[PDB]
């Protein structure tokens, strides 16, 4: 994992609506961080926003082109 | 190739079981108490 990918996956699991949205708007402009970046234990950013029951980060991710595949079961 | 998958979904199942089956304790209470306390002093220091 990149340090900015770990900065995005540590932006989520803390409840940020600012730095997560800034990283998802920088992801559109530059191909710097892939949104579908996994933890070392699976765990995409969407699944991190699912284990912590925060619906605002879920709507913020699902407005972007996140891979939603097999994450409804989680 | 099989062992890598078994270790990966094993460790995922064990952290899942630690999230479900671990009961709450006093230090987890101190963590919430410091989060509300520290957020309290931070808001009072911004509004003061």
Nearest-angstrom CA–CA distance, B17 and B3: 20
Q: How many residues does chain A have?
A: 74
Nearest-angstrom CA–CA distance, A9 and A7: 6
Nearest-angstrom CA–CA distance, B21 and A17: 30
Is residue A15 within 8 Å of A57, Cβ to Cβ? yes
Nearest CA-CA distance, residue B26 and chain A, Å: 21
Nearest CA-CA distance, residue B48 and chain A, Å: 25
Nearest-angstrom CA–CA distance, A51 and A59: 15
Is residue A11 within 8 Å of A26, Cβ to Cβ? no
For residue A24, count CB atoms less than 10 angstroms from its CB and return exposed for 0-12, middle for 13-18, buried for 19 or more.
buried
Q: What is the resolution of this structure in A?
A: 2.9
User: Are the Cβ atoms of A51 and B19 closer than 8 angstroms?
Assistant: yes
Nearest to A13 by CA among A64, A41, A54, A67: A54
Judged by DSSP in three states, A39 sits in: strand
Is residue A45 within 8 Å of A74, Cβ to Cβ? no
Residues 2-41 on B with a CB inside 8 Å of A are: 8, 11-12, 15, 19
Nearest-angstrom CA–CA distance, A12 and B1: 31
Determination method here?
cryo-EM
């Amino acid at each position: 994992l990149s340090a900015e990918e770990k900065a995005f996956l540590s932006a989520v699991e803390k409840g940020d609506y600012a730095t997560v949205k800034q990283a998802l708007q920088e992801a559109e402009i530059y191909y710097n961080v892939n949104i579908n970046c996994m933890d070392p234990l699976g765990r995409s950013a969407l699944l991190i926003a699912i284990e912590n029951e925060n619906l605002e980060i879920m709507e913020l991710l699902l407005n972007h082109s996140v891979y939603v595949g097999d994450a409804l079961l989680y | 190739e099989v062992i890598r998958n078994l270790v990966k979904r094993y460790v995922a199942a064990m952290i899942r079981n630690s999230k479900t089956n671990e009961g709450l304790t006093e230090e987890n209470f101190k963590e919430l108490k410091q989060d509300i306390s520290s957020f309290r002093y931070e808001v009072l220091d911004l509004l003061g």
